[PDB]
Design an enzyme around this catalytic site. Structure first.
Site, PDB file in Angstrom:
ATOM      1  N   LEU A  41       0.987 -19.210 -16.097  1.00  0.00           N
ATOM      2  CA  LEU A  41      -0.179 -19.963 -16.533  1.00  0.00           C
ATOM      3  C   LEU A  41      -0.138 -20.349 -18.006  1.00  0.00           C
ATOM      4  O   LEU A  41      -0.772 -21.334 -18.376  1.00  0.00           O
ATOM      5  CB  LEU A  41      -1.472 -19.178 -16.274  1.00  0.00           C
ATOM      6  CG  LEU A  41      -1.754 -18.842 -14.809  1.00  0.00           C
ATOM      7  CD1 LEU A  41      -3.069 -18.100 -14.704  1.00  0.00           C
ATOM      8  CD2 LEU A  41      -1.805 -20.016 -13.912  1.00  0.00           C
ATOM      9  N   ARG A  43       1.644 -19.128 -22.295  1.00  0.00           N
ATOM     10  CA  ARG A  43       2.311 -18.197 -23.184  1.00  0.00           C
ATOM     11  C   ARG A  43       1.676 -18.308 -24.560  1.00  0.00           C
ATOM     12  O   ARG A  43       1.203 -19.373 -24.970  1.00  0.00           O
ATOM     13  CB  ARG A  43       3.817 -18.456 -23.258  1.00  0.00           C
ATOM     14  CG  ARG A  43       4.605 -17.294 -23.844  1.00  0.00           C
ATOM     15  CD  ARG A  43       6.088 -17.633 -24.050  1.00  0.00           C
ATOM     16  NE  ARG A  43       6.244 -18.795 -24.924  1.00  0.00           N
ATOM     17  CZ  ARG A  43       7.403 -19.245 -25.403  1.00  0.00           C
ATOM     18  NH1 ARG A  43       8.544 -18.630 -25.108  1.00  0.00           N
ATOM     19  NH2 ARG A  43       7.422 -20.320 -26.186  1.00  0.00           N
ATOM     20  N   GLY A  44       1.646 -17.186 -25.260  1.00  0.00           N
ATOM     21  CA  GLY A  44       1.091 -17.131 -26.593  1.00  0.00           C
ATOM     22  C   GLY A  44       2.020 -16.325 -27.471  1.00  0.00           C
ATOM     23  O   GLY A  44       3.090 -15.903 -27.039  1.00  0.00           O
ATOM     24  N   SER A  47       1.847 -12.705 -25.852  1.00  0.00           N
ATOM     25  CA  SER A  47       1.727 -12.419 -24.430  1.00  0.00           C
ATOM     26  C   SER A  47       2.173 -13.615 -23.608  1.00  0.00           C
ATOM     27  O   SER A  47       2.290 -14.733 -24.106  1.00  0.00           O
ATOM     28  CB  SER A  47       0.282 -12.049 -24.071  1.00  0.00           C
ATOM     29  OG  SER A  47      -0.551 -13.176 -24.224  1.00  0.00           O
ATOM     30  N   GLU A  48       2.385 -13.365 -22.332  1.00  0.00           N
ATOM     31  CA  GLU A  48       2.537 -14.414 -21.340  1.00  0.00           C
ATOM     32  C   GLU A  48       1.604 -14.066 -20.200  1.00  0.00           C
ATOM     33  O   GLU A  48       1.463 -12.897 -19.850  1.00  0.00           O
ATOM     34  CB  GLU A  48       3.978 -14.378 -20.878  1.00  0.00           C
ATOM     35  CG  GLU A  48       4.574 -15.507 -20.123  1.00  0.00           C
ATOM     36  CD  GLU A  48       6.116 -15.352 -20.099  1.00  0.00           C
ATOM     37  OE1 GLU A  48       6.795 -16.366 -20.124  1.00  0.00           O
ATOM     38  OE2 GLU A  48       6.655 -14.221 -20.126  1.00  0.00           O
ATOM     39  N   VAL A  49       1.060 -15.092 -19.555  1.00  0.00           N
ATOM     40  CA  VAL A  49       0.028 -14.936 -18.540  1.00  0.00           C
ATOM     41  C   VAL A  49       0.523 -15.544 -17.242  1.00  0.00           C
ATOM     42  O   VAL A  49       1.002 -16.682 -17.220  1.00  0.00           O
ATOM     43  CB  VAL A  49      -1.294 -15.578 -19.001  1.00  0.00           C
ATOM     44  CG1 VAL A  49      -2.352 -15.428 -17.974  1.00  0.00           C
ATOM     45  CG2 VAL A  49      -1.684 -14.946 -20.303  1.00  0.00           C
ATOM     46  N   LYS A  64      -1.460 -10.417 -17.751  1.00  0.00           N
ATOM     47  CA  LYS A  64      -1.109 -10.747 -19.130  1.00  0.00           C
ATOM     48  C   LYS A  64      -0.110  -9.697 -19.589  1.00  0.00           C
ATOM     49  O   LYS A  64      -0.478  -8.545 -19.815  1.00  0.00           O
ATOM     50  CB  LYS A  64      -2.381 -10.717 -19.979  1.00  0.00           C
ATOM     51  CG  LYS A  64      -2.230 -11.002 -21.420  1.00  0.00           C
ATOM     52  CD  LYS A  64      -3.568 -10.798 -22.199  1.00  0.00           C
ATOM     53  CE  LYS A  64      -3.373 -10.999 -23.656  1.00  0.00           C
ATOM     54  NZ  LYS A  64      -4.707 -10.960 -24.179  1.00  0.00           N
ATOM     55  N   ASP A 152     -12.252 -15.420 -31.543  1.00  0.00           N
ATOM     56  CA  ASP A 152     -11.391 -16.498 -31.059  1.00  0.00           C
ATOM     57  C   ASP A 152     -12.121 -17.311 -29.998  1.00  0.00           C
ATOM     58  O   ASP A 152     -11.528 -17.741 -29.005  1.00  0.00           O
ATOM     59  CB  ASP A 152     -10.046 -15.964 -30.558  1.00  0.00           C
ATOM     60  CG  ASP A 152      -8.981 -17.031 -30.442  1.00  0.00           C
ATOM     61  OD1 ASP A 152      -9.091 -18.102 -31.056  1.00  0.00           O
ATOM     62  OD2 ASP A 152      -7.989 -16.757 -29.732  1.00  0.00           O
TER      63      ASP A 152
HETATM   64 BR1  QWW Z   1      -7.179 -13.724 -18.419  1.00  0.00          BR
HETATM   65  C1  QWW Z   1      -6.759 -15.544 -18.018  1.00  0.00           C
HETATM   66  N1  QWW Z   1      -5.959 -16.242 -18.794  1.00  0.00           N
HETATM   67  C2  QWW Z   1      -5.616 -17.501 -18.419  1.00  0.00           C
HETATM   68  N2  QWW Z   1      -4.820 -18.414 -19.056  1.00  0.00           N
HETATM   69  N3  QWW Z   1      -4.831 -19.570 -18.336  1.00  0.00           N
HETATM   70  N4  QWW Z   1      -5.610 -19.365 -17.239  1.00  0.00           N
HETATM   71  C3  QWW Z   1      -6.108 -18.094 -17.300  1.00  0.00           C
HETATM   72  C4  QWW Z   1      -6.984 -17.341 -16.508  1.00  0.00           C
HETATM   73 BR2  QWW Z   1      -7.713 -18.153 -14.936  1.00  0.00          BR
HETATM   74  C5  QWW Z   1      -7.311 -16.058 -16.864  1.00  0.00           C
HETATM   75 BR3  QWW Z   1      -8.423 -14.981 -15.724  1.00  0.00          BR
END
Ligand code: QWW
Length: 328
Positions: A41, A43-44, A47-49, A64, A152
């Site tokens: 979903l 990346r930062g 972290s990566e999500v 995450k 944030d």
């Molecule tokens: Br936590 C989280 N982080 C996200 N980054 N992009 N979509 C996301 C969602 Br949906 C959630 Br829940």
């Protein structure tokens, strides 16, 4: 003794030390092998999500994965999320897990089927904006009451499922506990959502930082200019703010708090009158703007952090009366 919060100032000092002493927190790390990653979903820097499925119960979740070296910061985010457990419209932490071999930690959150904000903010109605802002305010009032500044607030961190009308405030990795007279790092928030206090290097800030960011979001929604204050860098960010709120008004704020102004600003701030909020109205946004929206906005986008509305005072504003009426 320069500044303190008008609300919730002493709340952490009135609690057990364990509540806020995150360095002493010992998470219980479960097993990431219960989760199957399905799609990246985002990346930062930290972290990566991923969207994922819990294979034991078929639940769809978001994982995450934390770049693992930042141990104090991991404890901070985990403890904050534990303390916020059950809070209204705060993303729900389901579990804290590790890869059982590498020991890399990850946080598991409830899934939200969000609507991309760039698209969403072009289709919101007046009532929609009131509703979502009220729901976001519930999350902020909750975290502030729990002694926590998010630091944030921005559209990406406000997930909105526009079909089910669900909102969650995500990404607590920059959040911190508020303690009176504590000096905080000003390198928080996205550029466009940084309060003037951050831009002028004033470290003794509080929950009211989040209320500036919220005000920026409100302006973007009712005026359909996203982001509302579009600086090219941190210096230009303050210039963009001052072109609306005024330069003489900026100097009054600095004088009140004895704030030293970086002299690079001398060559770029210019001289600007304070603008009327009605100047932002035109045919494309007029159906979103009311006297009550502008009065609320004017009380959020103020230089003086002490004078901004609290989340509760904002929720109590007439702008939200139509939402309260529907909820009741
Ligand atoms: Br936590 C989280 N982080 C996200 N980054 N992009 N979509 C996301 C969602 Br949906 C959630 Br829940």
């Amino acid at each position: 003794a320069g500044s303190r919060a008008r609300v919730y100032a002493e709340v952490n000092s009135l609690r057990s030390r364990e509540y806020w002493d995150y360095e002493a927190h010992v998470p219980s790390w479960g097993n990431q092998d219960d989760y199957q990653l399905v799609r990246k979903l985002g990346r930062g820097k930290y972290s990566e999500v991923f969207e994922a499925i819990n294979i034991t119960n078929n639940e769809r979740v978001v994982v995450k994965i934390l770049k693992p070296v930042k141990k104090k910061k991991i404890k901070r985010e985990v403890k904050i999320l534990e303390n916020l457990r059950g809070g209204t419209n705060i993303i729900k932490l389901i579990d804290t897990v590790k890869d059982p071999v590498s020991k890399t930690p990850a946080l598991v959150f409830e899934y939200i089927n969000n609507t991309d904000f760039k698209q969403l903010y072009q289709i919101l109605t007046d009532f929609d904006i009131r509703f979502y802002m009220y729901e976001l305010l519930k999350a902020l009032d909750y975290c502030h009451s729990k002694g926590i500044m998010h630091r944030d607030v921005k559209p990406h961190n406000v997930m909105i499922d526009h079909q089910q009308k669900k909102l969650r405030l995500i990404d607590w990795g920059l959040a911190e506990f508020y303690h009176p007279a504590q000096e905080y790092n000003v390198r928080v928030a996205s550029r466009y959502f940084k309060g003037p206090e951050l831009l002028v290097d004033y470290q003794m800030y509080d929950y009211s930082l989040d209320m500036w960011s919220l005000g920026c979001m409100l302006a973007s929604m009712i005026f359909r200019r996203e982001p509302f204050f579009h600086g090219q860098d941190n210096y230009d960010q303050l210039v963009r703010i001052a072109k609306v709120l005024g330069t003489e008004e900026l100097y009054g704020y600095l004088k009140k708090y004895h704030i030293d102004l970086d002299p690079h600003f001398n060559d770029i701030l210019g001289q600007h009158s304070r603008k009327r909020w009605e100047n932002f109205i035109h045919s494309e946004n007029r159906h979103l703007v009311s006297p009550e929206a502008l009065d609320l906005l004017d009380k959020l986008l103020r230089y003086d952090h002490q004078q901004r509305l609290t989340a509760k005072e904002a929720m109590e504003h007439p702008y939200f009366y139509p939402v309260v009426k529907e909820q009741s």
